[PDB]
């Protein structure tokens, strides 16, 4: 169920091979399958040569916590996944970004977590990995190939990312106001003031449901309903050559607009498709990605389509009583 979306895991041979910018959605998803995006992130920010996700690709990334509802649906996008597709940004952790306790950081080369106001990734440079606490990168000869298995990657959180329906600032302000109401004893989350409490604890691990609705910070939630709507939009399909892999942006724009390519049931239903007498000797075939759909959060008497919906560990300070 949690296999690849489109591409079996990579077997890179050169850690110095360039990572190409691909325009095609099915191209980019294939990179996401091969954890080429995380490898890209690492090369960009962390003095990293090579790749993570060797052999195992995205389906084998480590998660915290390890029971992880959303990883079972390969087509559910983690923060790094959305970042590759331009939907959010996983920023490079700096000194003011708290590493949540809990995860097995040891030996990890990349981990990321949603934070109260964004998404933060920690990297390690070539031939280094993380200490058990994750505070430091230290030598690790076990990573000298620069082709690292997927378990050197840690995605913190049961997190799902999707195209949002933007909400007016006043709505977010109301959600924000409900969130404060539901968590009166949380003062700061991930350094960001959440409630006003002159008097607060050291930052504590904080596991919480939350949605990113595209404003200054996420809105954390206790009692809330979620609903998964299968929307069958063209982002929910992937177009490939069953062996030659994903199709060009032109090829995939054809299939999702002209209805002349091959496709599983849902794709022919919603975009049309031609079976038999393949006009092109090498035609493409689009299929639905394995995911429950788009999540609509009901919270504070409101319904939202958020950027991300997640349950994950953040750092919160507690009010002194």
């Amino acid at each position: 169920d949690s296999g690849p979306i489109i591409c079996a895991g990579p077997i890179h041979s050169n850690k110095s091979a360039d990572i190409p910018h691909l325009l095609g959605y099915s191209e980019k998803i294939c990179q996401i399958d091969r954890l080429i995006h995380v490898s890209s992130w690492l090369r960009n920010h962390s003095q990293f040569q090579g790749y993570v996700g060797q052999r195992g690709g995205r389906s084998q990334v480590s998660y915290y916590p390890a029971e992880n509802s959303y990883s079972r649906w390969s087509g559910l996008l983690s923060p790094c996944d959305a970042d590759w597709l331009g939907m959010l940004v996983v920023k490079k952790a700096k000194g003011s970004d708290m590493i949540v306790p809990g995860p097995s950081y040891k030996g990890k080369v990349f981990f990321e977590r949603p934070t109260f106001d964004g998404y933060v990734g920690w990297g390690c440079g070539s031939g280094k990995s993380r200490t058990e606490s994750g505070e430091l990168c230290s030598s690790d000869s076990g990573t000298s190939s620069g082709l690292l298995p997927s378990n050197r990657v840690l995605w913190i959180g049961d997190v799902a990312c999707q195209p949002m329906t933007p909400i007016p600032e006043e709505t977010f302000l109301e959600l924000k106001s409900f969130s404060q109401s539901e968590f009166p004893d949380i003062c700061k989350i991930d350094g960001i003031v959440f409630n006003q409490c002159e008097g607060e604890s050291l930052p504590q691990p904080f596991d919480v449901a939350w949605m990113d609705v595209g404003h200054s910070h996420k809105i954390i939630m206790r009692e809330h309903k979620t609903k998964w709507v299968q929307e069958s939009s063209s982002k929910d399909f992937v177009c490939y050559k069953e062996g030659t892999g994903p199709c060009s942006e032109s090829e995939e724009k054809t299939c999702k607009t002209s209805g002349s390519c091959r496709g599983d049931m849902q794709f022919c239903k919603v975009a049309g498709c031609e079976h038999g007498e393949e006009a092109s000797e090498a035609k493409c075939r689009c299929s639905l990605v394995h995911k429950p759909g788009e999540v609509v959060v009901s919270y504070g008497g409101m319904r939202v389509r958020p950027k991300c919906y997640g349950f994950s560990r953040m750092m919160a300070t507690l009010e002194v009583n």
């Epitope: 920010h45 940004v89 000194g95 440079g125």
Partner: antibody, heavy 122, light 108 residues
Framework: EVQLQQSGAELVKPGASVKLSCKAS????????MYWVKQRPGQGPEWIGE????????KFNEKFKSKATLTVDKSSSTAYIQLSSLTSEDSAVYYC???????????????WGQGTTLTVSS | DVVMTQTPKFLLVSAGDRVTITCKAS??????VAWYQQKPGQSPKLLIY???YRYTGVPDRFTGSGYGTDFTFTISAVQAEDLAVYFC?????????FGGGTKLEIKR
Amino acid sequence: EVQLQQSGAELVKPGASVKLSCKASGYTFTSHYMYWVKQRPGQGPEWIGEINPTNGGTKFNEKFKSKATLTVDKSSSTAYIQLSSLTSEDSAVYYCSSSGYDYDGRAYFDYWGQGTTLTVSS
Amino acid sequence: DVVMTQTPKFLLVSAGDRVTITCKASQSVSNDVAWYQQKPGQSPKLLIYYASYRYTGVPDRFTGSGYGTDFTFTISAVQAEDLAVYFCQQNYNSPYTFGGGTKLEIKR
């Protein structure tokens, strides 16, 4: 495209205050912290503070917490520094800069104002 | 707060010589140190970011290396143009702090 345009040379009597301005252009003003760095003649730079143009939130070099007030006008892509209680030791070049990772372009960027010169003297 | 101890304060070298500037952070700053070249009358010009990446449009000769607390900036072959003050900057944790620079001067 990208330009941090700083306000012109300034000469103020001691004890006066002065508002230096930096107009950002060519990039999304609110996506990048603005930093102010002071540099005295022939000295190295002093990092003054950072302002978050989304927030007006600021982190200061403690040596400047009372010397400078940092504000940002989103509406005109302008970061301002208000240097008060000026003595001759405030005479210097003041730079605004934004640097960091541009997550939109996916490249590091490092942009500096032309510098604004302050002479504290009567 | 985080002190960046940049050595040497002065270099005298001949065009063609290798120059290595070292910066020791008083505490770990990841790879978040930038190397600026500053020529007189000019603002600082970023050469190296993220400890070891040339900023775009930077000649091959300028390189940087380091992680944690030990950062090295190198001009593999100094050219006369490279008269400037060089300084690391930690941008890991605020307040961002500068190395005391290095006046590079050309023996001639």
